[PDB]
Design a protein around this nucleic acid. Structure first.
Length: 117
DNA sequence: AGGAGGGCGAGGGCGATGCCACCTACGGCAAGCTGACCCTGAAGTTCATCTGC
């Protein structure tokens, strides 16, 4: 299949995830779990139950990198000492990539909640 | 000769066997270095080589 047809990802989809890593490895999403630079972003948030969406205008928007802090400040909690036993159900994608030499080793992949992390 | 050789019951009673404090002071528990070399890449082309012409 020779180098990318081994994994037939469309141009419109290859571009999307490549520039998705590019921004999260250049955004606030990037944070090293330990020696393993990781991009965490919130999954598709629930429909933002009506009452809470009543106050929110628009209403609520799924900003992808919104509550990444919940997971960023979970691993940061190991050094902050500010660990709180979290109740999740807000699932945070956590792609814990790391360099091989010039490939990217996915060391973590967690669609799980910050409680499961 | 035939003797009798103690019988009795006591042999502690009373309390005290410690009092007082002290059982540490001081400071140091590290210094200094290293914590790794080396490579292993994608991607592409070249270049040497092979097959077929």
């Amino acid at each position: 299949k020779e180098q990318g047809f081994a994994f037939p990802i469309g141009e419109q989809a290859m571009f999307e995830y490549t520039t998705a890593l590019n921004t999260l490895l250049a955004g606030e999403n990037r944070f090293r779990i330990g020696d393993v630079t990781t991009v965490c972003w919130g999954a598709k948030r629930t429909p933002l139950e009506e009452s809470l969406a009543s106050m929110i205008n628009g209403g609520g928007k799924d900003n992808p990198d919104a509550h990444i802090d919940a997971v960023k400040a979970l691993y940061k909690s190991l050094y902050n000492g500010q660990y709180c036993k979290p109740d999740g159900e807000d699932k945070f994608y956590l792609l814990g990539l790391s360099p091989n030499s010039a490939r990217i080793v996915v060391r973590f992949w967690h669609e799980t909640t910050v409680a499961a992390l």
